[PDB]
Amino acid sequence: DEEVQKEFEDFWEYYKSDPFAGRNVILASLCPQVFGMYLVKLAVAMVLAGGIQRTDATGTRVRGESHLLLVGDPGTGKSQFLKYAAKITPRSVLTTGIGSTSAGLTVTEAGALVLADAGLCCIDQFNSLKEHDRTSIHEAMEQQTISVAKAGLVCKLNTRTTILAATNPKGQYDPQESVSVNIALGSPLLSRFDLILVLLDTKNEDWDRIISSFILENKGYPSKSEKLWSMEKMKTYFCLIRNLQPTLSDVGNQVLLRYYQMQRQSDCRNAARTTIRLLESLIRLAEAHARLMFRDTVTLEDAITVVSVMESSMQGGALLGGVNALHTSFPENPGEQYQRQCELILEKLELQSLLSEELRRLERL
Template sequence: MDECSGTGKDLAGYLIRHHSDQLRSIILSPDPPLHYPLYVDFAELMDEHPPVAHLLFSQPTHYLPLFDQAALWAQKIIYPDLKGWDNASLKEFVHVRIDVSGSPLESPETFPSIGRIRVKHRGILLTLKGTVIRSGAVKMIEGEREFICRKCKIRFKVYPELETRNTLPQPLSCPSQGSKICEGTSFQFVEGSTVCHDYQEIKIQESTQVLGVGAIPRSIPIILMDDLVDIVKAGDDIIVTGVLSAKWSSVLKDVRCDLDPVLIANHVRRTNELKSDIDIPDDVVMTIKQFWLKFKDAPLKGRNAVLRGICPQIFGLFTVKLAVALTLIGGVQHVDASGTKIRGESHLLLVGDPGTGKSQFLKFAAKLSNRSVITTGLGSTSAGLTVTAVKDGGEWMLEAGALVLADGGLCCIDEFDSMREHDRATIHEAMEQQTISIAKAGLVTTLGTRTIVFGATNPKGHYDPSQTLSVNTALSGPLLSRFDIVLVLLDTKNPEWDAVVSSHILGQADPERGKQDDDFDNIWPLSMLRRYIHFVKGYFKPVLTKEAERVISSYYQMQRRIAVQNAARTTVRMLESLIRLAQAHARLMFRNEVTRLDAITAILCIESSMTTSAIVDSVGNALHSNFTDNPDGEYAKQERLILKRLSSIDEVTDPNDVAASIT
C-alpha cells in the first residue's frame, strides 16, 4: 500500500479532509452490496498534492486501485463516529471517480478528438468527448477468481484480461516468491471467491460539427462498469475520462487480427443540459439589452436588424429569414395535468424551385444550432433517420440515427421529396410525439427525439397554384400538417427584382459595402446570432396575453370555416403552431409576454404558408419578400387590416372586443 510519493494513509487523509460528507453518506447508505462512487476533483487534488496528481495521470492503472483501497481505509477511520446510526456499515465496493472538469487535463494533449487517438495516449488518464451512438445491454462479468496451490497452499487471485475479451486465464505456475519458490502447476479453485461486476459497452462518435468537409467521424467503444452502467443512452452527449487500452479484434478467417482501441471509463459526465459549446458572457448579455433599449421606439426595426444576420449572402427573402429564426427559437413546451406533452419545437418546410437558396438556409440553420445533423432524402433510409439494429459479437444492439443524434437540436433534411414514402412515414411520430418507438430484433423500446425538423423540397413538376400543397409536393396531408410553416418559393420572372438581386450579388465584392456590413446595427455576426438564439430560448418563457389569445382564436375559427384547399393544414395542429410561433416571436423580440404584435406576426407566417390567403389580400411570393425601410409603419397597416377582417368575419368572439383593440 505504501508508495514513495504518497502512501495509502496520505490518500485516505486527503479523502477524509475533502470528501468526508460523501464518505458519511456512503457509510449510512442502507445497501452494503452495492457499488458506490466517490467523486474526486482533479483540480483540487493537483492544488494539494501535485506529485500524486501527476502519478495518477501518468499511471492510472496503478493509482486508481490505490485510491479505491484508500477509500476503504478512510471509511474505517470515520466509521466509529457513525456506529450508533441506523444502517451504518462499511461498504466493500467504493470506486473513486476522477472529475477532470476545470483542470489542466482539459487540454488538447489529454483531451484529443476521437479521430486523433494514438498509441502515445495508451496508459494515461485520457478524456474524450462524443455522442453515444450505440448502447449495449448490461451484462455480468467475473472480476476476479481465487485459487490455492495444491503444493504450497498459497492463495492468489486471477483477474480477467481485456485484450482477450475479458477471459479469465487458467494459472500456469505458482506465483509464490521468496527463498522457497514453489514450482507447482496444480491449483484448486476456492468456492465462493468469485467477484462479479456489472458491465456495459457503449460506442461514442465525435461530433460532425467540429470536423472539416470530407472527414469521416470516428468512433470508439467505451467500457462502463459497476455504478457507471446504464447512466447514458443513445443520443446523449458525454465527456468520459478513463484509461485507453486495447483488445484483440474477433478472429475471422483470412482477416488480419488487430488490436482495437477501447477506453475503460472511470468517470462519465452527460453534457446534454450543459450545452457547454455556447458560452454567453455577461458583457454579451449587456450588449443585447443595450441593443433593444436603442430600438425601444421601433422594435420591429431592431428585429429586422437581427434577421439580416441570417444568410446575409442571400438578398431579401425576409419571410424565409423570419421563419428560420422563429423555427430555431421555438415555443414553450406545455405539459397538461394528465402528463401529455405538447411540443415546443417548430418544424419548417421550404418548397421551392431550383436556385432559390433552400440548401443555403439549411446549412446556415445548422451552424446556428448548437447541435445539428444534416442529411439528404435520397441518402437516408428509415433506419438511418430513426434507429437501426446491429449485431455485434452475437448480441443485437440499437444504433442511433439522425433524428436521435439531433435530440435537443436541429435535423436538416434536404431533397425531402426524394425520400421513399415508407421512410417519410417513419418521421411522423418523431415530429409530433417527439419519440421513436421501435421493435426490432426483439428490442422493444422508445427513444426521445426532441428535434426541430427543417426540410427542403422541390415541387413535383411545375408548381400549380390552383392545386393543393399536397398535390404540388406529393407529400401526404398528415405529414404537411406537422410542419408549422410551409413556405413556397416560386422563381417567377420579375424584372425589377432580378435587377436588385443582380446588383446585390455584384456589389458583394465591393470593399465599401463590406465595411457597412460590419456595423453591428446593420448585420449581426454568426457567433452573436448563435448566442442570442441560445440565450432567449433559455431565458424567456413567454405567456399569452388575453388580447393575443382573442386574435389567435378568432383567426383559427375563421380558417376552420372557410378552409377548402388547405384542409390538410387547418387542423388543431394549426392552433398549436400559431401559439408556438407567437411565443417564438416574443422571445425574438426579447420579451416574456406574447402581445398582439406577436399574434399578428404568427398569423402572417401561417398566411404565407397557405395556398390561398384567407385574410391578407396579397401575401406575395416569399422569394420576393424584402426588408422594408419602415417595418413598424408597415406592420401598423397590416394589423389594422387583419383585425378589421377578423372582427367582420368572426361570429364567436365579440367583434367589439377585437375592433376595440385596433385603437
C-alpha cells in the first residue's frame, strides 16, 4: 500500500533541516510509561533494528544480529523494557528462564530458541540459569545453528534469534570489580554480548521528586502534545525498515578502523572486551543505525553516533569517561550536541582532514 510509504516519506522529509529531531521523536515513543533513560532507550532501538548477514561461498557464514544485557539494582525498570520489547516485534516468545527447563533452551520437539526464528527471545533472571543450560547455549549464540547427535539421530536445526536478557547483580554492587567478578560469569560467555549497560542508583534530590510527582499525579506522557505514536505505527515502522540494505563508505570505515587499533592497547585493554569480536560488532551497530534513519549509505554521522554509545558501554576503564545511564534526559537541541561531539572525538584520534569537510557540510544544510 502506497499510503504507508507516503506517510513515512512525508514525516522524514519534513524533518530535513534538523535530522536528529526525527530520531528523538522516534525514541520518545519507546516505553512511554517511564521518564528519562536516554541511552537505555537508544540501545534497545539499535539492537532491535538488526543487521545484515554475509555468508562465504564454501562453508562458513558470520553473524548478522546483536545481543544486549542489562544489570541494575532492583526497582529500575528492566521488566518493563523486556515486556514492552516483547510486543512490538512480530514473533516473540517470553520465558522465565530459571523457570524454564532444558527442553526450551535447546532441542529435545522444538524448544524456545528454535521456536523463535527471525524473532527475539526475551530472557529474564539470568543469574542462576542452571549452569549446564547456561553453557549449552554458547554454540547457539554465536553460530546461529544447533549441532547435536543425541540418541544417534544426527539432526541439525537453525536458530536466528536476538537474545535480550537482564540479570540482578548478586552481591552488593561495587564501582570497581568489573562485572566478571560481581556477576561471576565466565570470560568465554561474557564476550558475545555487544553492550553491557550498568544501571546504578545513587544519591539525588531532584530525580526523586520528579519520579514521585510522575507516579502520584498519574500524569501519563507529560508531553501533552498529541505527536506520540500508536503501537501499530511503530510496529509497521520496525517491520518496514528491515528490508533496506545499507552499504559501507570511505568517510566511514576509517574511523572504526582507527578506534579499534587505538583501543587494542591503551594501558589495560580491559580483560575480555578487546578481542577481535569487537570490530565485528562495531560494524553491525553502525549498519543498524543507518537503517533507522531511512538511508542506505553509512556516513561520518552514523559512525560518530555509534562510537559514543560503545564508549559509554565499557564501564569504568575507558578512554573518555563513564556516564551513568539512569541520570540522563533528552537534550533540548541535539544539533549542537552533535556538533560538539564530532569536534571532541575527531581531535585525539587524528583525522582532522575530515573535520573541515564535515563542518562545511553542516554549514550549508
